[PDB]
Design a protein around this ligand. Structure first.
Ligand SMILES: CCCCCCCCCCCCCC(=O)O
Lengths: 202, 35
């Protein structure tokens, strides 16, 4: 995932549980680090209001827009629990980056989490890193209710209407370097969490 | 709301949710549903 202007290096959602002050269990729900998808086929699942996905895909560039399908690993128990998200982007040029994460239900924006972060020079590149960004309480409550569900096909039916929109902006220009439209299922695999990357078009 | 989404899948009878086109019935790649 990425252009020649900004590449996504790592994405990770996790639950961290502290046993004793020296022992920590970490469980990954989804982690990062195929054929194209018609973006019109999915406009209904993301906000289309002022600054919605329809607007942003016109704005360009069309090579920067991606649909990610996650198979989430919900196989964990649930004190000292921390719900987090880690992300990392690498660029060849320095920038003041803005990151937008929208949690959406039935296409309606439920919560926006907006974050501003600067680069640090590393190995001839410019790295942007959000470390242990707290999941908002809606998300924690959402994960919990998926877990109370008896069957791992009920989870899928519910997740059909839940999406995450991730947008990375150059705060000075107002240019979009990365957009990720995230769709969701629960993993059936013994290998755990998985993902498909498709670019959006049309 | 939140629970309405969940209640829908738990109890089909009293389901109160906006009807939408299932993902599996849209114009999407074959590899989109293959894990
Ligand atoms: C099956 C649902 C599991 C959720 C998958 C993790 C998604 C990663 C984004 C988490 C939301 C962080 C943004 C926020 O809470 O403010």
């Amino acid at each position: 995932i990425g252009t020649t202007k900004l590449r996504l290096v790592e994405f990770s959602a996790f639950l961290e549980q502290q046993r004793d002050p020296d022992s920590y269990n970490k469980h990954l729900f989804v982690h990062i680090g195929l054929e194209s998808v018609d973006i019109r086929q999915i406009y209904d699942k993301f906000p289309e209001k002022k600054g919605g996905l329809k607007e942003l895909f016109g704005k360009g560039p069309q090579n920067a827009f991606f649909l990610v399908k996650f198979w989430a690993d919900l196989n964990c128990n649930i004190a000292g629990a921390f719900y987090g998200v880690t992300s990392q982007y690498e660029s060849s040029e320095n920038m003041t980056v803005t990151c937008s994460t929208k949690v959406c239900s039935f296409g309606k924006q439920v919560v926006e989490k907006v974050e501003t972060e600067y680069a640090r020079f590393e190995n001839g590149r410019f790295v942007y890193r959000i470390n242990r960004s707290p999941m908002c309480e809606y998300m924690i409550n959402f994960i919990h209710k998926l877990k109370h569900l008896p069957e791992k096909y009920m989870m899928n039916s519910v997740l059909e209407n839940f999406t995450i929109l991730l947008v990375v902006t150059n705060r000075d220009t107002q240019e979009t370097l990365l957009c990720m439209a995230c769709v969701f299922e629960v993993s059936n695999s013994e290998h755990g969490a998985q993902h498909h990357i498709h670019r959006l078009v049309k | 709301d939140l629970e309405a989404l969940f209640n829908a899948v738990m109890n089909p009878k009293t389901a109160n949710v906006p009807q939408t086109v299932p993902m599996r019935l849209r114009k999407l790649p074959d590899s989109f549903f293959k894990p």
